[model samples]
Target: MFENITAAPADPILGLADLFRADERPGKINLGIGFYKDETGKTPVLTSVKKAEQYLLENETTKNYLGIDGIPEFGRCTQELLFGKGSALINDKRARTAQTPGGTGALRVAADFLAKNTSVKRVWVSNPSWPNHKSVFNSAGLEVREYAYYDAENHTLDFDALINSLNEAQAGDVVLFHGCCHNPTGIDPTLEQWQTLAQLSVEKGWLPLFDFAYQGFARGLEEDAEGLRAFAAMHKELIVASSYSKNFGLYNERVGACTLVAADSETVDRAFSQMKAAIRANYSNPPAHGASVVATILSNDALRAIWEQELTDMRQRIQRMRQLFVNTLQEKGANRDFSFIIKQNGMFSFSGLTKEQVLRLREEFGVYAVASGRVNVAGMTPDNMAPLCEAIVAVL
Candidate 1:
């Protein structure tokens, strides 16, 4: 008696992966999905994570369910990683954390909490944010607005326009900031710019929500967290959603946490109780495996060092890829200057290719990228870099 379901569009990023798999081209390259691939084109599981798992398997444990907030150690370690171990907010008991399925899950949880607990009706995201940012917040009943961010004309941040838009935000409004490593466009504000944003948030009384999906993938962990740390130091109230997927190579593990900073210990306690209620209504509890692995690694000093070194290796590889791409383009005597690729941070660079150009690259050259020209720098390898550069230059 019920038959009104219609077809839905394939996901922009994931659908491209499906198409790439079906294409039987030998030299085809898939740069659509956002994930770290090594020189051998493999998404390796970090050795630290493997050791952590081994520890968990050896230790005495039961399959009992963790409460709504998930593992206590996981939440504590996650908070420490985001805010420094000696952060004043944590020491003063002003922060609370709840482990989630992943960064996306953390975002959804935060959106739901904001929608239900406060008068915040809208959230301002960067203009070309990850495509799901809009859908997730909309699903949680918050209006999503875009502020000027990346400037395509010159391929840099439109700081003036961004500052203007943020200045217009009303008190109590919510604004989303990529903690670091902005997706699609790897461009991030300079430290001084981030300080300005922190000051603006205080002046406008806007609630800042930070999405930190790629913490260590940018610069070093401490360096990358400078933006978020600035806000935490200045602002009494803030929200952060952090992920371990990129940092720990736990993509499928879906490890992340949602952290909220309140005015005081009592306020933090109340807020955490409310968050638990929301969690109970949603997924009931997060999975144990991924969080346990993260906690184990963080708790052990040796493992932590190994994890950091591995993360550094990944970060340096991406940076090298960025340099190699620009160098290759110049060596080939491509008429255009592509130096902006090296300046961008993280796994992505908003290559200035248009929709038609992207289509041509995919169909004619077996190279796949987002229509917006967002290419995953982590996907580039020595073998594929030359062909990829040729394809891009041809499209240009």
Candidate 2:
């Protein structure tokens, strides 16, 4: 039986990272993975996180088991971050949270809970969403469907088509939305559009599930949570999966939370209990270190300030890079309108490069990007931008 089992294919994003590492080209640049890189071309650990670890080392009382719900402080911190400090979602006792392995873990746990408790069998995801969205839902027994989102024709959102699709969804269907900084495409719904979507969900009785993996990376932390908070206000029932990986640079620690919001305290309690069951059946409880770091930082004013500064710096740098990429491409006499890169929010921009152009960049210019032409804008630095832009121009 062991001999009969074949090895699975490598993950598309991870596999691209591997190829980039193996390439010995002196000028090779990696824009494949969505991870943020500083101006120095490195993924630096936050200073606030380091300080938290120091505090934990000196003041920790015990290595006690955290249970399936994880650190209560971390859960509350997540709520405050995503739903505002005193969100009605929390004030009314309609929301509850549990820690999970990471954003991916939260998604899986939420999927499992929905699969077990609700009549929901299908989850609607944005077209050209993070590739892992499908894998997570499908593995947890939820059928996945794609709704209209990014419109390639105009390089913008197709709201008319999107609303029409959501209108047709059944009451029990789960619609997975990116709370902010939509992965891969780097496009997001405006505040007014989010309101409309929330209203549609209420009218259809569909479950709005949000994956807020890049909270601070797109805009400021509070600004990024606007969509989720808006939706939580209008809609009584919602599901959220949040991660500290992107915001806190705790990628390896796998720190995240899964939350369910209902109309009343009893349903909230029931949802929390169901989450614990799913977590226990899987990983027992999430790790304590990363969650502890995030919680500690959020709890202390000084540390929180430091974390905010770091996040602001990262956000500003990405914006600078976006401008630089567009300017450089234009300077090189590329006739295409690359100015849209400046307008695209978050860490990525779909460069509109076809698959053939992408392959040409990889094979000829030692530049790596997702097959769909989605490049991680945050990964480019001042030093690397010229070469990267040159490669794009050459490929086109």
Candidate 3:
């Protein structure tokens, strides 16, 4: 009966990772994945997380189930961290939060909720968004639409075209915005542009769903959240899905949350009930340890400060790598101006290389990048920078 089941194609980014793992090349570098790597080319566990683990080990109790909404402290901590402590929405009971497995899990739950509750038959995402955005939405039986985003012609945001396209969205539609630190491309809309998008959301009566996978990783925590805060302040209704994976270095822990903000307590209560029901039908409760770790870190001033410092270090390291990548490209005498990578924020940059050049980097130079020439800047280290640069120059 299962004879007709076909094999699936490999994931572009992860497939290259598999290839890199299999290769015996001494200098093989994996720039395909977005996970952060330190200067020593390792993704280290955070000190605060270690301490949290120790605390959990010593002071822990039973491993009872968390029910559908996971840990309540985790949800509360998520709302506090994302929407700010003592936010008006939270204080007024116009907001609710639920823990999910991770960023992707939050998104999946939100998509499913949108499909079930709202009249939203489709959702719109940036044209050059994370590949899984479409897949996850489609899994919820919602049609996925793409809007103008990155301008390949000049390697910048096409703000005018983007707003123009968004203006066409009908009421009850969902528009997914990267709250900060847009994935793959790393280019984000300006504050002014975000204000315009928020206005458009209000004008069109569209739901502004923010997938904030990377907040503090872009600039600093306060700075990175400017866009989301603006939307939250302006709109009576909005949704946010966030992850602690990148900022808190809790990738495997699968820590994340889905937040909903409504106009009043009644609306918020209804939305909360619906979301909990969806969670009940899905994965039930999320894990406890990861969310507990995040909650402990955020609740303590000292631990929060330390975690922020670690995040700042990670951001600066990515920035430094971006600069080094650009400088090396220029040093290699590439005819093209590749300096734009330095200006691009966050973990990735659109390297302007064609698909073939990306393939060449993988096959000939043992360097792996996304097929779209999107490289994770955090993957570059001092040892790998020169060779990677050389490979780019040669391939181009």
Candidate 4:
């Protein structure tokens, strides 16, 4: 039985992580995995999260099951985070959020819901989106398509081409947008561009689903959500999958939500009931600890402030690394203009290194990166910068 089984290829990002962990080389630079590594080369837990966990451990609680939608407080916080506190959508009770296992879990649930409950069969993601986007949607029995995103030649958001591609989308299709801090490429649309895209989405009659994995990693929390808010303000229906794994450094905790916003309270209620059915068939219920910590920190004024500052520190550090990477490349006389990295946000950027070059960087230099040349900018530190750039220059 099962004698014909053959080994499948390792995941591009996580597979590199596996190789990086096993390579015993000292100072082996890992620009592969999409994780937020601090300057000290560790993904430390946030102070606010620890404080929240401490409080939860001490306070009264039960080890019981949550509804399919999970914690009420977590749902409320997610809505507030997506749309500000005074948003009309919230005031009218038009949004419903369900706590999920993680960002990937949130995405899978959204894909399942779209496939099961809605008439949507086609989903369009950015060309250079996180690899899992297509995988999750395709796994849910939906046709996955790609829209133009980054222009590798010019190193900018290919807005005109994006608009052209999305124009091909028809009514009832779903177009997934990165809320902020786009993965891999790291390029995001400007505020004006976001507004234009929102209007185009409405005109194209496609539903919008926002993948908001890195809210605080790009800009400030409130500022980073402007694009999502634009869609919520204009569109009658929207879906959002948010993650706290990156922001709260709760990667192992697996915390996230899938939020559905509809035209009216009644519509949201109906849609939410169907969403609960989708979730019940899958994971059944979400884990409590991570969501409890997120809710506790968000609802408390003091804890919220502490988390805000901590997130800002992470954002600023990533920005510094992006600039430092460019400057170091210039200092090495790489003969390549790498300054566009500074213009991008989040933990990643396309390093413009070809597949063979990336292979050389990994095979010869022990500097791991994706075959597509997407390097995790947050992986760089002051101590690791010199050797990392030297290896990069050699590959170039």
Candidate 5:
């Protein structure tokens, strides 16, 4: 049986990183993986996180196992971060949370819990969503479907098509939404569009599940959560999977939360119980160190202030990089109008380069990007921008 098992293909995103690592080119540029890096081409640890770790090092008592729900303070802090501190649902005791390994783990836990405990089994995702969205839901036995999201011709969001697809969804169906800085494609709906979607969700009785991987990376923390908060105001039942890997720079630590907004305390009680069972059966419990670090920063005002400022800096740097890319391309007299790169939000830009062009970029120019033409804006720096832009223009 062991000999019969065949080999598996490399993951699209991680495999690209591996290939980038193996290349011996002197001026290679990697814009494939999603992690955020500074202008120095380094993924630096946050000052707040360093301080939190130091505090934990001096204060932590033991390496005891956190319960199935993980740290209590961590859950509370995570809830406040996702839903605002003044959120009525949280104040009313309607929201429930379970700490997970990361946003990916939270998505899987929610998928399994929904399949096991609820009547809903169908989940609708964006057409150009994060590559793992469909696979995660499918592995948990949920029927995953696609909704129109990106318009290739205009390089913008196909909002009309997206609303039309949501209108067709039946009651009790689950819709997975990117809370902010949508992965793969950086296009996001405007505030008015979010309100329209909230109204539509209420009309159709569809359950909204928000995948919030990049909360502070786009716009600001409060502004980025406008869509999710809009839905939470109108809908009694909602699901949110949040990750600190990006915002907190805890990629290796794998810290995140699975949250649910129920109708009442009774509903929250049942939901929490089932969610705990899901965690107990899956990974026993989440790691303690990352959660403790997050909890410490959130609970302390001075530390929280430092974290917020650092996050703002990261957000501004990505915006500057986006502008620089577009400006440099125009300065180079590229034939194509590449203004869409400036308009796109978050860390990625759907550059509209074809598969063959992407391969040429990799093989001929030593520049790597996803086959779908998604480039990580965070990976770019002043030093690499000129050559990267030249490679792109040459391929085009």
Candidate 6:
């Protein structure tokens, strides 16, 4: 049976990374992957992570398997991080969280639960969302639809088009939102826009499921929560798939949570049981170590402060890179307005570079960017910024 199979297509993003890895060019710049890089061009583990691991080493007594929904403390800390510190949702018992392998796993579990339990059959995503958005829902046997999101020509969110597209979604549909720091395009809606979207969700009766992979990447942690918070205020039930991958530098740790909010405690319990069933069928339970680390760091005050400062440093570095990129592009005499790049947030930039230009950068200058022109802004550093700009201009 295996021998009869045809070759499958590689993941476009991972395929690009593999090509970058095989390239022998010494000056090759990899702006393809989504991971955050520091000034030294390394995706280093946060200092707080190492310290938390050390704390876990001394305290952890069991090698036992976690429960179907992971440890209780992990869920508690996850709620605090998801909502504010003194989250009324927790006190009111309107929410429940289940730990999963990663943001990807959380998304799948959410998708499975929606497909299996909820009446909602279609999940709407941005037109040019993270490529996996369509795949995740489609693989889960749910229909995937695209709501207009990015305006590539203007390098901004297409608000009116997005509203018009989403208006077509009837009641009992699920619309996925980037909780913060929209991927691929790196263009997020403003506060007023989120209010409108939330109000629309309430009016249309479409379930809002936020893919919150980059929570603290834009502005502060609290600031980033404002969008989802707006939805919580308007909608009685919503879902958030949260990941510590980027914020905690726990990319390999596979620690994330699928949090479901309901109208009350009993309903939350009902919703969460289905969420656990989805996880039990997928991977049984989450791995304990990463989830343990997240719980330890977020619970302890000293470690939490350390982690917060470290996240701040990472956010500031990317912010600086965004500015430098636009300035460098201008200095390189590129005949385009890159000032829009700075306006975008998170690790990605939806560069207006065409597919042809992206290929040329890869072929000639060993500069890797997605065919859709999404470049990882965190990949740029002071050393490679100028060359990246030059390669970009050359392709243009």
Give the distance in Å from residue 246's predicted Cα in candidate 4 to where it truly belongs: 0.5
The local distance difference test score of model 6 is 0.90
| lDDT digits (tens) for residues 301-367 of candidate 4 | 9999999999999999999998888999889877888888888989989888899999998889999
How much lDDT does each candidate structure score? 0.91, 0.88, 0.86, 0.91, 0.91, 0.90
Model 3, range 68-184, lDDT digits (tens) per residue? 877777778778667887588788888888889999999999989989987889899998899889989999999999899989988999998898787778888889999887877
Q: How high a TM-score does candidate 4 get?
A: 0.98
User: Model 2 off-target regions past 4 Å?
Assistant: none
Q: What is the TM-score of each candidate against the true structure?
A: 0.98, 0.98, 0.97, 0.98, 0.98, 0.98
Minimal lDDT window, size 10, model 3: 77-86
Off by over 4 Å in 4: none
Q: Tens digit of lDDT per residue, candidate 1, span 73-150?
A: 998888878898888988998999999999999999998888998899999999899999998999999999889998
Error of 6 at 118 (Å): 1.9
TM-score of model 2 vs. true structure = 0.98
Candidate 2 residue pairs in backbone clash: none
In model 5, where do residues sit more than 4 Å from their true spots? none
Candidates 1 and 6 compared by lDDT, better number = 1
* Overall local distance difference test of candidate 3: 0.86
Considering TM-score, which of the candidate structures 3 and 5 is the better prediction for this target? 5
Q: How far is candidate 4 from the true structure (C-alpha RMSD, Å)?
A: 1.1
Model 6 residue 68 CA deviation in Å: 1.0
